[PDB]
Design an enzyme around this catalytic site. Structure first.
Site, PDB file in Angstrom:
ATOM      1  N   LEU A  48    -121.165  73.355  29.484  1.00  0.00           N
ATOM      2  CA  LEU A  48    -122.486  73.081  30.515  1.00  0.00           C
ATOM      3  C   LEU A  48    -122.183  73.147  31.694  1.00  0.00           C
ATOM      4  O   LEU A  48    -123.576  73.630  32.266  1.00  0.00           O
ATOM      5  CB  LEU A  48    -122.472  71.534  29.876  1.00  0.00           C
ATOM      6  CG  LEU A  48    -122.662  70.930  27.859  1.00  0.00           C
ATOM      7  CD1 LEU A  48    -122.455  69.626  28.543  1.00  0.00           C
ATOM      8  CD2 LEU A  48    -124.211  71.207  28.073  1.00  0.00           C
ATOM      9  N   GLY A  49    -120.720  73.182  32.272  1.00  0.00           N
ATOM     10  CA  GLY A  49    -120.277  74.170  33.272  1.00  0.00           C
ATOM     11  C   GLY A  49    -118.926  73.263  33.886  1.00  0.00           C
ATOM     12  O   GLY A  49    -118.092  72.674  33.113  1.00  0.00           O
ATOM     13  N   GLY A  50    -118.819  72.835  35.442  1.00  0.00           N
ATOM     14  CA  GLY A  50    -117.652  72.064  35.594  1.00  0.00           C
ATOM     15  C   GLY A  50    -117.282  72.372  36.866  1.00  0.00           C
ATOM     16  O   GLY A  50    -118.301  72.803  37.481  1.00  0.00           O
ATOM     17  N   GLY A  51    -115.742  72.018  36.778  1.00  0.00           N
ATOM     18  CA  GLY A  51    -115.517  71.635  38.319  1.00  0.00           C
ATOM     19  C   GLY A  51    -114.652  70.839  38.977  1.00  0.00           C
ATOM     20  O   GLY A  51    -113.755  71.242  38.441  1.00  0.00           O
ATOM     21  N   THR A  52    -113.974  70.695  39.943  1.00  0.00           N
ATOM     22  CA  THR A  52    -113.384  70.210  40.487  1.00  0.00           C
ATOM     23  C   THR A  52    -112.243  69.310  39.342  1.00  0.00           C
ATOM     24  O   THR A  52    -111.323  68.936  39.284  1.00  0.00           O
ATOM     25  CB  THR A  52    -112.950  69.377  41.728  1.00  0.00           C
ATOM     26  OG1 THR A  52    -113.641  68.528  42.021  1.00  0.00           O
ATOM     27  CG2 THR A  52    -112.642  70.699  43.250  1.00  0.00           C
ATOM     28  N   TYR A  53    -113.638  68.611  39.377  1.00  0.00           N
ATOM     29  CA  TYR A  53    -113.454  67.256  37.635  1.00  0.00           C
ATOM     30  C   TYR A  53    -113.474  67.924  36.657  1.00  0.00           C
ATOM     31  O   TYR A  53    -113.209  66.683  35.630  1.00  0.00           O
ATOM     32  CB  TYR A  53    -114.726  66.424  37.970  1.00  0.00           C
ATOM     33  CG  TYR A  53    -115.914  67.348  37.721  1.00  0.00           C
ATOM     34  CD1 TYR A  53    -116.250  67.469  36.256  1.00  0.00           C
ATOM     35  CD2 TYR A  53    -117.405  68.057  38.725  1.00  0.00           C
ATOM     36  CE1 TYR A  53    -117.574  69.133  35.677  1.00  0.00           C
ATOM     37  CE2 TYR A  53    -117.999  68.689  38.375  1.00  0.00           C
ATOM     38  CZ  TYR A  53    -118.704  69.069  36.665  1.00  0.00           C
ATOM     39  OH  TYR A  53    -119.666  69.730  36.666  1.00  0.00           O
ATOM     40  N   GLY A  54    -113.804  68.816  35.909  1.00  0.00           N
ATOM     41  CA  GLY A  54    -113.034  69.498  34.619  1.00  0.00           C
ATOM     42  C   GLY A  54    -114.058  70.069  34.135  1.00  0.00           C
ATOM     43  O   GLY A  54    -114.848  71.108  35.273  1.00  0.00           O
ATOM     44  N   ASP A  57    -119.063  60.609  46.085  1.00  0.00           N
ATOM     45  CA  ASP A  57    -119.944  62.165  46.096  1.00  0.00           C
ATOM     46  C   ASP A  57    -120.584  62.245  45.126  1.00  0.00           C
ATOM     47  O   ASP A  57    -120.859  62.387  44.428  1.00  0.00           O
ATOM     48  CB  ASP A  57    -118.430  62.579  44.151  1.00  0.00           C
ATOM     49  CG  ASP A  57    -118.436  64.101  43.782  1.00  0.00           C
ATOM     50  OD1 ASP A  57    -118.990  64.618  45.346  1.00  0.00           O
ATOM     51  OD2 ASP A  57    -118.248  64.677  42.435  1.00  0.00           O
ATOM     52  N   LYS A 111    -114.740  66.523  28.916  1.00  0.00           N
ATOM     53  CA  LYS A 111    -114.638  66.782  30.261  1.00  0.00           C
ATOM     54  C   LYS A 111    -113.608  67.187  29.424  1.00  0.00           C
ATOM     55  O   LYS A 111    -112.324  66.601  29.251  1.00  0.00           O
ATOM     56  CB  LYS A 111    -115.030  66.000  30.376  1.00  0.00           C
ATOM     57  CG  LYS A 111    -115.316  66.204  32.512  1.00  0.00           C
ATOM     58  CD  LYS A 111    -115.130  65.810  33.285  1.00  0.00           C
ATOM     59  CE  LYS A 111    -114.893  64.016  32.780  1.00  0.00           C
ATOM     60  NZ  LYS A 111    -116.064  63.264  33.730  1.00  0.00           N
TER      61      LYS A 111
HETATM   62  C1  LIG Z   1    -121.228  70.043  34.144  1.00  0.00           C
HETATM   63  N1  LIG Z   1    -121.341  68.969  34.447  1.00  0.00           N
HETATM   64  C2  LIG Z   1    -121.765  68.258  33.311  1.00  0.00           C
HETATM   65  N2  LIG Z   1    -122.133  68.122  32.208  1.00  0.00           N
HETATM   66  C3  LIG Z   1    -123.473  67.524  31.685  1.00  0.00           C
HETATM   67  N3  LIG Z   1    -124.282  67.939  30.645  1.00  0.00           N
HETATM   68  C4  LIG Z   1    -125.443  69.110  31.128  1.00  0.00           C
HETATM   69  C5  LIG Z   1    -126.024  69.338  29.747  1.00  0.00           C
HETATM   70  C6  LIG Z   1    -127.201  70.089  29.976  1.00  0.00           C
HETATM   71  C7  LIG Z   1    -127.217  71.404  31.193  1.00  0.00           C
HETATM   72  N4  LIG Z   1    -127.818  72.283  31.402  1.00  0.00           N
HETATM   73  C8  LIG Z   1    -128.638  71.992  30.158  1.00  0.00           C
HETATM   74  C9  LIG Z   1    -129.042  74.004  29.619  1.00  0.00           C
HETATM   75  O1  LIG Z   1    -129.519  74.438  31.136  1.00  0.00           O
HETATM   76  C10 LIG Z   1    -129.121  74.205  32.350  1.00  0.00           C
HETATM   77  C11 LIG Z   1    -128.293  72.315  32.512  1.00  0.00           C
HETATM   78  C12 LIG Z   1    -126.071  71.223  31.821  1.00  0.00           C
HETATM   79  C13 LIG Z   1    -125.125  70.117  32.205  1.00  0.00           C
HETATM   80  C14 LIG Z   1    -122.135  65.768  31.583  1.00  0.00           C
HETATM   81  C15 LIG Z   1    -123.566  64.997  30.388  1.00  0.00           C
HETATM   82  N5  LIG Z   1    -122.630  64.215  31.094  1.00  0.00           N
HETATM   83  O2  LIG Z   1    -123.951  65.724  29.480  1.00  0.00           O
HETATM   84  N6  LIG Z   1    -121.731  65.446  32.719  1.00  0.00           N
HETATM   85  C16 LIG Z   1    -121.261  66.837  33.664  1.00  0.00           C
HETATM   86  C17 LIG Z   1    -120.228  65.000  34.497  1.00  0.00           C
HETATM   87  C18 LIG Z   1    -118.776  64.761  33.679  1.00  0.00           C
HETATM   88  N7  LIG Z   1    -118.484  64.374  34.654  1.00  0.00           N
HETATM   89  C19 LIG Z   1    -118.200  64.255  35.720  1.00  0.00           C
HETATM   90  C20 LIG Z   1    -119.554  65.089  36.754  1.00  0.00           C
HETATM   91  C21 LIG Z   1    -120.317  65.706  35.490  1.00  0.00           C
HETATM   92  N8  LIG Z   1    -120.818  66.888  36.364  1.00  0.00           N
HETATM   93  C22 LIG Z   1    -120.867  66.481  37.076  1.00  0.00           C
HETATM   94  N9  LIG Z   1    -119.351  65.486  37.578  1.00  0.00           N
HETATM   95  C23 LIG Z   1    -118.968  65.149  39.006  1.00  0.00           C
END
Ligand SMILES: CNc1nc(Nc2ccc(N3CCOCC3)cc2)c(C(N)=O)nc1-c1cncc2c1ncn2C
Length: 287
Positions: free
Chosen positions: A17-23, A131, A40
């Site tokens: 789904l993505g990531g960064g400094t947090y994992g 943050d 994560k």
């Molecule tokens: C990549 N980050 C996260 N993505 C998540 N889900 C998610 C679900 C869907 C998308 N899409 C779907 C397709 O179109 C583009 C968007 C992107 C992301 C989640 C979650 N719980 O669902 N959590 C984090 C996460 C977790 N911990 C700390 C974090 C996080 N984000 C920032 N910080 C500091």
């Protein structure tokens, strides 16, 4: 609480789904219930003792609020810590506005109210988020608003890089935080400033000064004559929204209102603020 096993034993790892400094965050499905979760992966550092790791997982399990993504459990496996959490299907507000375009004043008002509820809870637990930005505020398919985590304070994995990341991207930080490595500390009121910048971000698709080199922004922010940002288009936003930006972006933290005080501001205490506003926003993803 922290299972000494591969999370793949219980979860089917789907896409990243993505990531960064947090994992690194992955979409995953429970093999038994079929429910969708987020997994994560946080890589453990050479000095991450399991005794401190245990204290952190206890904090992750007790620091709970409706406006913070729920923690389900964790796994320690092959130097990687895996945190299982609620899946927020629509991703972050940045993932959304970089498809839909700028949020309406009512949509921003509802998001700011829900984030302030989460911040007021975090501040009552003597935590500072540090943050707050659109990419760290997630939306589920029901239009609910949740902070991805409780902030940078988790002493797990890449804590230092996460704590110092704003130096390369300081746009959302309060001036007293941007005064990094100087004698003045900061307090929880820095999150109130970051929420005011986030509101301009949802309105304008970028925080103020985003195109300025991060080190130049740090310089400008620690100047006596620094004027806090404002919305670029006055003749679109109401007097209430301008005032909400004015008070959240108060330069002195000794004059900036608390999260609890901000919850009674006319902008976020107005009638008709509910998840339906975000359901309308998510409908724009179809077009
Ligand atoms: C990549 N980050 C996260 N993505 C998540 N889900 C998610 C679900 C869907 C998308 N899409 C779907 C397709 O179109 C583009 C968007 C992107 C992301 C989640 C979650 N719980 O669902 N959590 C984090 C996460 C977790 N911990 C700390 C974090 C996080 N984000 C920032 N910080 C500091």
């Amino acid at each position: 609480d922290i299972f000494n096993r591969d999370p793949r034993d219980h979860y089917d790892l789907l896409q990243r789904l993505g990531g960064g400094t947090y994992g690194e965050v992955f979409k995953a499905r429970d093999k038994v219930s079929g429910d969708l979760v987020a997994l994560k992966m946080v890589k453990m550092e050479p000095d991450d003792d399991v005794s401190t790791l245990q204290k952190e997982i206890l904090i992750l399990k007790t620091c709970r609020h409706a406006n913070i993504v729920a923690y389900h459990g964790s796994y320690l496996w092959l130097q990687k810590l895996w945190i299982c959490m609620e899946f927020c299907g629509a991703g972050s507000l940045q993932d959304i506005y970089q498809v839909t375009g700028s949020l309406s004043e009512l949509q921003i008002s509802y998001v700011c109210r829900e984030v302030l509820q989460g911040l007021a809870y975090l501040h009552s637990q003597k935590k500072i988020h540090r943050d707050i930005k659109g990419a760290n505020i997630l939306i589920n398919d029901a239009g609910e608003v949740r902070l991805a985590d409780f902030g940078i304070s988790a002493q797990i994995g890449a804590e230092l890089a996460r704590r110092l990341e704003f130096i390369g991207t300081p746009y959302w930080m309060a001036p007293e935080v941007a005064a990094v490595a100087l004698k003045g500390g900061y307090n929880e009121l820095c999150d109130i400033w970051s929420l005011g910048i986030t509101a301009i971000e949802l309105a304008e698709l970028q925080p103020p000064l985003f195109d300025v080199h991060p080190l130049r922004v740090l310089f400008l922010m620690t100047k006596s004559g620094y004027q806090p940002p404002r919305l670029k288009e006055k003749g679109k936003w109401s007097a209430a929204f301008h005032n909400f930006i004015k008070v959240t972006l108060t330069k002195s933290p000794k004059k900036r209102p608390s999260a609890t005080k901000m919850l009674s501001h006319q902008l976020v205490s107005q009638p008709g603020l509910n998840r339906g506003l975000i359901l309308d926003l998510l409908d724009k993803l179809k077009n």
